[PDB]
Amino acid sequence: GSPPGPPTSIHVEEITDTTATLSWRPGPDNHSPITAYTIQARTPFSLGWQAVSTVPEVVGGSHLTATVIELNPWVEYEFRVLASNAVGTGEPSKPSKKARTKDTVPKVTPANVSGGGGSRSELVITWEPVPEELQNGAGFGYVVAFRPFGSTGWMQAAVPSPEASKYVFKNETILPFSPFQVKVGAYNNKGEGPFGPVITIYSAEEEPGRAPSRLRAKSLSASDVEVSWKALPWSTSKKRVLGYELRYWEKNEKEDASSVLRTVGNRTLAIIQGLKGSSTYYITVRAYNTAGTGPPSPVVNITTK
């Protein structure tokens, strides 16, 4: 004997939200009785034909129908069937006419919810967009829920773009770097999915309001300058200074073309390297946090070498 021919006339008998019952006509067995049928599916969201699970778990050679299980709601599927005997597995059937599974409400929650930062008086929330095949119906979107820490009433923002990964709430009553409880869910035309777990997200900061003081520069060589300054006083974990930004430009160059060195943390000293000898540089220092830079120090000048 030889491997079986293709089965024919794959037909979708019934389709639900997660199953599809198929029928087919047997092809030639080529003198070795058919011992199994296997089904594969194709969708617009994955490359190529893929194995699927069935009831019964193994489709015997005397079965001309079976139910494909664990499909995703509101997805367009093609199916095809392969016949096997003791000799081998035959060529796949021609595919069934495309059919969409029924829709349901979203089941997953948006993954990897986070947030923070942003511009003045904003609250920035982020998440991983839900993959298309898990959206379960048309009209898919996100429900972003939030409330200032210590309050009861929730606010809900809808984000009707299935591709979106961020929502920015802007309101002037948000004090800087204020804690919010946040949770994110999905919805579609069939209804709402569940919210994920509640997490704490901080609103945007405000730029530091003080310039640093005591900016001094000392020439160490033809190319290196030691810059030191005094930290801003009274910075806290709530009104933060993350580091400082040094800007430096050569005399008779524009301030707009300045080089930039940033520190992170508490050390208010840095060496600027790579300079030209016997050359005068202007330097300023500013504090920064995630909202941006504060006012600059006065300009200090230093001549190398």
Author numbering: 598 to 902
Relevant lines from the article:
Contactins (CNTNs) are neural cell adhesion molecules that encode axon-target specificity during the patterning of the vertebrate visual and olfactory systems. Because CNTNs are tethered to the plasma membrane by a glycosylphosphatidylinositol anchor, they lack an intracellular region to communicate across the membrane. Instead, they form coreceptor complexes with distinct transmembrane proteins to transmit signals inside the cell. Finally, structural analyses of five CNTN–amyloid pairs indicate that these proteins interact through a conserved interface involving the second fibronectin type III repeat of CNTNs and the copper-binding domain of amyloid proteins.
Introducing the T751A and V752A mutations in chicken CNTN4 reduced its affinity for APP by fourfold, so we found it intriguing that these changes occur naturally in zebrafish CNTN4. We thus decided to gain structural insights into the zebrafish complexes to determine the extent to which details of interactions differed when compared with chicken CNTN4–APP. Finally, complex formation does not involve any substantial structural change in CNTN4, since the structure of the unbound FN2 domain in CNTN4 matches those of amyloid-bound CNTN4 closely.
